[PDB]
């Protein structure tokens, strides 16, 4: 079942080969959990970076479902996402237009500054079922003023995108979603199906776009053959003062029906009522402490309202962090609904979504929830995310984590998983074992007192001497009578006294 | 705010009027009137009555629409029933415009 | 939660009579030292060290205005009406946050032993005790829910941390049972159980030790 | 803003409260006040400033009381004019500080 | 200064926390000042040690079939050198010793 061969035979000639291509793309099954699963999955398998920004040579293997990249500032987490997004731009361009051009590496900024060979390579390998196990793509750029230029290799991306485009043109198919949500998400004609690819790899997920769109959908979906509708419009026109509003509504419905009838197979789309409902469900499922979202016009202005932690409030009452996250999910859901019209649940469509700094502007409380439901709402998306948050990491399995070593001078070959299991672990342990951060701030003197106290006890055969007593009193005075620190000190005293008593009994 | 009473003095001696403020204010009035349920019930009652007369006149094609509107009316009545000053304001202005501007009915 | 021993009644409750008098009238500094004798400077329900503290009506003054100036009904609870932030356990939550409850299905710590109903896990949850059914289960469940003994993160945290501090010492004592004669080892455990009356969350520390 | 304006210019005006956004919607008195007290050594233990704004059509106006801030800023300005002194720094860094960098940079106008 | 407003957004004073923060452990500040669990409550694995303890206490401190299964799950998930497994081991040791004492009595 080689897809490229089937497609080549289709292009040269015919119905059988077309059907084979279409079945390869569209066939799937519903699993035990009731979730639709494509027979032929699409995901990024491997990424290699050569003399790109800080990286001399880096190789990353990605998970099919979720990969989280972690490290200090300036380790190149954003650089990795940028590299992937540029590669994905070639698929998007060619789904939209034959021979469309994707984006390219910068000759000013993207070449490593001390690269002896003055060029950079971003090599990606994609997977599309057993029929197409390897789709390699390479973006290349030579430094400014180099005599010899290095060419990018994008033909496999174009070939695959061509299959999607051509098959869709003849008969509507579901299409993959590609989106990037960078840190800039926080900054302050009729709708066509392929608007889903507009600003998908930069510019996606702005709150204002959502609110406007949502109110628009509400106004349209407030309040059926064309011939029957034409007859109803004609009957209502003959009657026409009180029925004039109804006539205008019916004329609109007729125009919409004609438009849908006139509209092409390649741009087939679900009703506005359905679109609205799916997005509402996505928001309520994913966004923590939002249980409901709706549009009010009772006050005389259009207000989006939400039920937040059991209280009905205006969406402007949400924090900026909670708004930005709501915008991200809404935007994603919107694209998925447009690109997956043939699925019972359009959010079970395929795609690759990149999110930079997922915890951006989030209080710790909602950091503990954000990832729980993302994978449940979008089961066939490959998520590639970056974070600094131990709270986020406490909700994710170690297999999904890729960490930069703290001593990495940009020479290292692989990113690997942490040694410790993060999912369900305590915050302090993640900080120490995964993020290399001490539980107490090293730059504060008082941070060392309990440690020093313990050492003093051990040095004086467990007896509380003048020096240990002074420090004990300092701990008590600074942290307080019911402080954890003092309780630990008390515990140490008690255990050391018991150990000494045992030692005396043994000596006698 | 366009609904605030002293907004009536905003740019009143600037020379142009504020026709934009009128349109905003008028849409505001409309939304409030539509959102008032009893007027909506009265309007719905009137629509149901008009549609019932059409069905009684031999137009069997609009029976489906009548049933839908009767359902909507019943639902509106079922929802907690309580004249909007906003409704009167709207009517006054509409009449003024139509009376003074000859081409506008 | 501890078994409390209510022993002597203060003079001022004789003077004030229910119906005529209001709780705003009565002087509170007369009442406290008898409670502080009973409760040891610790909260009735959670076993905080009391520092922001109020007098609580176990059966409230709204539902039971007859049971108002009654020495049985009064307890010293953690929390404060005055200071900013809605307090989220004990006295204050019973009224505001817990909502609907039958006061018959709550452990009263002066009357009853809580230990037969409640179990304190060393992981820092309080749970119903091993093998309860019917009413005995329903009291355990509703006491936990209404006083918010697990759901207050500040309380859940503090108790968990207090116990986890002593679990090296518990581990170590029960190794030495091997070597010593009974009366010396029984003295050791008696001594440790003596100390924890001075400590916060004394019930939870008991269950860890015993 | 009232200190900065008056250090720069005699009679300089700082910023004002908005009638639309700064007044609480359900305020019975229909005005808003922002009151600050500054300290400047034991010789000037209290420098009070109030920024005020009333709703349109209220019977009385609520005006800002800025004179102490202006008087202090005038000392800094006038003394500096005669003989250079050190001056205070005032700055606000919002979440807006996270913005992209224009690599292309302007010639020294001076 | 802690800013906990009411449902209307209004507050009268801002309070300092009761706990000293300077030089304290981050996990304590999370729980005592920010009001967030140090372990994610929405993750099942976060409750396994608690459940394990309860099973051990239900079977008079002896590892039964059910407690052994969960022990193995903890070992498999968190690993042989995990703090969680050490705590489980500790629980076993302590409870076995307590039960032995109870039998002697
Ligand atoms: N062309 C380049 N040559 C060398 N180092 C570069 C180049 N471009 C960026 N860097 C380095 O890459 C790092 C920035 O990577 P970035 O992905 O933005 O970091 P983060 O992991 O914080 O998102 C910095 O250490 C910067 O100095
Ligand atoms: Zn309490």
Q: What is the DSSP string of E34-101?
A: S---SS-TT-GGGGHHHHHHHHHHHTTT---HHHHHHHHHHHHHH-TT-HHHHHHHHHHHHHHHHHHH
Q: Atom 19 (ligand 1): residue with closest C-alpha?
A: A74
Write the DSSP assignment of A256-294 as a string of letters. HHHHHHHS-GGG----HHHHHHHHHHHHHHHSTTEEEEE
* B80 near D CB under 8 A: no
Using CA atoms in the order E67, E68, E74, E75, what is the torsion angle rounded to 10 degrees?
A: 160
Angle at D7 between CA D6 and CA D9, to 5 degrees: 60
Cα R_g (chain B), whole angstroms: 19
Residue given tokens 């915008």 in the structure block: A327
Gyration radius of chain A's alpha carbons: 30
| Contact by Cβ (8 Å): D19, D53 | yes
- CA–CA dist A18, A35 (Å, integer): 27
d(C-alpha A360, C-alpha A72), whole Å: 15
The distance in angstroms from the start CA to the end CA of chain D is 25
What Å distances lie between residue A275 and A213, A380, D99, CA to CA? Answer: 11, 19, 34
Spatial separation of the C-alpha atoms in residues A218 and A205, rounded to whole Å: 20
Write down how long chain B is.
Answer: 105
Q: Are the Cβ atoms of A446 and E82 closer than 8 angstroms?
A: no
H helix and E strand count, chain C: 7, 4
Q: Which residues surround the ion ligand 2 when the cut-off is CB under 5 Å? A: C 43, 45-46, 48, 78, 90
Residue from A49, A68, A72, A74 to probe ligand 1 pocket by mutation (most atoms less than 8 Å from CB): A74
Chain centroid to Cα A75, Å, comes to 20
Which atom of ligand 1 approaches the CA of A75 most closely?
21
For residues A504 and A147, what is the distance between their CA atoms, to the nearest angstrom? 84
CA B6 to chain CA centroid, Å, is: 24
Q: Is the CB of A462 under 6 A from ligand 1?
A: no
Give the list of residues 6+ apart from residue A265 with CB closer than 8 angstroms, or none: A169, A170, A171, A172
Q: Residue E34: which residues within 8 A CB-CB, separation 6 or more?
A: A363, A364, A365
Measured in angstroms, how far is the CA atom of residue A59 from the centroid of ligand 1?
A: 17
Look up residue C105 and give its DSSP letter.
Answer: S
Alpha carbon of A8 to those of A16, A20, A162: distances in Å?
A: 13, 12, 11
Q: Is A47 helix (H, G, I), strand (E, B) or coil?
A: strand
Helices (H), chain D: 2-8, 67-82
If you count DSSP H runs as helices and E runs as strands, how many of each does chain B have, helices first? Answer: 4, 0
Q: CB of A315 within 8 A of CB of A323? A: yes
Joined together, the tokens standing for residue A35 give 């979730």
Closest CA to D32 of D19, D14, D13: D19
Tokens representing residue A380 in the block: 């066939």
CA distances for C146 relative to A93, A366, C92, angstroms: 60, 26, 10
The Cα–Cα gap between A385 and A354 comes to 6
Question: Which tokens is C209 given?
Answer: 């030790």
Q: How far is the C-alpha of A479 from the C-alpha of A465, rounded, in Å?
A: 21
Count of C-beta atoms within a 10 Å radius of residue A283: 23
What is the Å distance from ligand 1's center to A408 Cα? 13
Question: In degrees rounded to 5, what are phi and psi of residue A125?
Answer: -120, 125
CA distance A68 to A370: 13
Strand A36-38 relative to strand A28-30: parallel, antiparallel, unpaired?
A: antiparallel
Phi and psi torsions of C67, nearest 5° = -85, 85
Per CB-CB distance under 8 Å, the chain A contacts of C161 are: 484, 487
Q: Using an 8 Å CB-CB cutoff, list chain B residues near D20.
A: 1
Task: Inspect the interface and report whether the beta carbons of A449 and E30 lie closer than 8 Å.
Answer: no
DSSP 8-class letter at A447: G
């Amino acid at each position: 079942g080689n897809l490229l061969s089937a497609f080549e035979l289709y292009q040269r000639n015919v119905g059988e080969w077309f059907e084979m291509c279409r079945d390869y793309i569209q066939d799937g099954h519903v699993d035990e959990s009731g979730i639709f699963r494509p027979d032929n999955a699409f995901y990024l398998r491997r990424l290699t970076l050569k003399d790109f920004r800080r990286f001399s040579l880096l190789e990353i293997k990605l998970e099919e479902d979720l990969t989280v990249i972690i490290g200090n500032n300036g380790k190149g987490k954003t650089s990795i996402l940028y590299a992937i997004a540029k590669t994905l731009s070639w698929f998007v361009a060619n789904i939209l237009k034959e021979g469309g051009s994707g984006q390219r590496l910068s000759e000013m900024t993207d070449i490593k500054n001390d690269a002896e060979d003055r060029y950079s390579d971003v090599s990606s390998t994609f997977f599309f079922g057993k029929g197409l196990k390897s789709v390699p793509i390479r973006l290349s750029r030579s430094a400014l003023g180099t005599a010899e230029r290095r060419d990018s290799e994008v033909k496999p991306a174009k070939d695959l995108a061509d299959i999607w485009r051509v098959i869709n043109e003849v008969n509507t198919i579901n299409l993959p979603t590609f989106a990037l949500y960078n840190v800039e998400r926080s900054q302050p004609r009729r709708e066509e199906r392929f608007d889903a690819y507009s600003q998908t790899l930069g510019g996606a997920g702005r709150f204002d776009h959502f609110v406007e769109w949502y109110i628009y959908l509400h106004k349209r979906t407030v309040s059926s053959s064309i011939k029957e509708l034409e007859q109803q419009v004609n009957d209502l026109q003959r009657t026409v003062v009180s029925v004039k509003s109804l006539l205008e509504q019916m004329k609109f419905k007729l125009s919409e029906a004609i438009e849908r009838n006139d509209a092409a197979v390649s741009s087939r789309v679900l009703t506005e009522s359905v679109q609205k409902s799916i997005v509402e469900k996505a928001i309520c499922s994913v966004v923590p402490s939002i249980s409901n979202i709706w549009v009010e016009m009772i006050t005389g202005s259009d207000l989006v309202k939400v039920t937040n932690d059991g209280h009905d409030v205006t969406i402007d009452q949400l924090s900026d962090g909670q708004r930005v996250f709501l915008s991200l999910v809404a935007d994603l859901a919107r694209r998925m609904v447009m690109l997956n019209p043939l699925l019972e649940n359009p959010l079970e469509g395929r795609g690759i979504v990149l999110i930079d700094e997922i915890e951006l502007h989030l209080h710790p409380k909602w950091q503990q929830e954000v990832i729980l439901n993302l994978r449940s709402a979008f089961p066939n998306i490959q998520f590639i995310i970056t974070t600094h948050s131990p709270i986020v990491l406490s909700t994710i399995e170690k297999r999904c984590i890729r960490e930069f070593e703290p001593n990495d001078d940009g020479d290292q070959s692989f990113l690997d998983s942490p040694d410790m299991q993060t999912k369900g672990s305590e915050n302090a342990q993640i900080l120490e074992q995964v993020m290399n951060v001490h539980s107490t701030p090293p730059g504060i003197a008082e941070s060392h007192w309990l440690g020093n106290f313990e050492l003093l006890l051990l040095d004086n055969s467990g007896e509380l001497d003048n020096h240990s007593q002074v420090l004990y009193d300092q701990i008590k005075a600074h942290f307080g009578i019911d402080s954890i620190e003092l309780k630990k000190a008390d515990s140490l005293i008690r255990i050391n006294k018991m150990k000494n008593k045992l030692n005396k009994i043994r000596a006698e | 705010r366009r609904e605030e009473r002293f907004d009536a003095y905003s740019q009143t001696l600037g020379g142009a009027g504020r026709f934009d403020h009128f349109v905003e204010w008028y849409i505001y009035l409309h939304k409030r009137t539509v959102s008032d349920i009893s007027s909506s019930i009265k309007e719905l009652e009137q629509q149901v009555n008009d549609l019932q007369r059409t069905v009684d006149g031999g137009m069997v094609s609009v029976k489906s629409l009548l049933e839908q509107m009767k359902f909507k009316l019943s639902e509106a009545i079922e929802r907690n029933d309580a004249v909007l000053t906003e409704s009167v304001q709207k009517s006054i202005v509409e009449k003024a415009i139509c009376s003074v501007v000859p081409s506008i009915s | 939660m501890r078994e409390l021993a209510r022993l002597e009644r203060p003079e001022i409750l004789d003077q004030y009579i229910a119906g005529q008098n209001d709780w705003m009238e009565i002087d509170q500094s007369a009442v406290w030292p008898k409670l502080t004798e009973m409760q040891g400077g610790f909260c009735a329900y959670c076993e905080c060290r009391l520092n922001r503290c109020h007098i609580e009506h176990f059966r409230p003054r709204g539902k039971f205005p007859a049971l108002t100036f009654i020495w049985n009904n009064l307890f010293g609870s953690c929390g404060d009406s005055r200071k900013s932030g809605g307090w989220s356990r004990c006295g204050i939550y019973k009224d505001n946050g817990a909502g609907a409850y039958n006061a018959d299905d709550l452990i009263k710590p002066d009357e009853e032993n809580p230990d037969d109903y409640l179990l304190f896990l060393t992981t820092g949850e309080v749970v119903p005790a091993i093998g309860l059914t019917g009413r005995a289960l329903k009291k355990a469940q509703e006491t936990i829910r209404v006083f918010n003994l697990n759901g207050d993160i500040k309380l859940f945290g503090s108790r968990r941390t207090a116990v986890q501090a002593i679990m090296p010492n518990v581990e170590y004592l029960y190794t030495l049972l091997e070597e010593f004669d009974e009366d010396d080892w029984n003295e050791m455990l008696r001594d440790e159980l003596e100390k924890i009356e001075s400590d916060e969350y004394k019930t939870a520390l008991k269950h860890a030790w015993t | 803003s009232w200190f900065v304006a008056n250090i720069l210019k005699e009679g300089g005006s700082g910023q004002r409260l908005s009638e639309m956004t700064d007044i609480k919607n359900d305020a019975e008195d229909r005005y808003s006040d922002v009151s600050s007290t500054f300290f400047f050594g034991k010789g000037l233990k209290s420098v009070p400033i109030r920024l005020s704004r009333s709703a349109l059509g209220t019977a009385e106006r609520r005006d800002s009381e800025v004179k102490p801030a202006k008087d202090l800023a005038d000392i800094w300005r006038v003394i500096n004019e005669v003989n250079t002194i050190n001056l205070p720094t005032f700055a606000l860094y919002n979440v807006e500080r996270s913005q992209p960098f224009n690599r292309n940079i302007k010639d020294n106008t001076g």
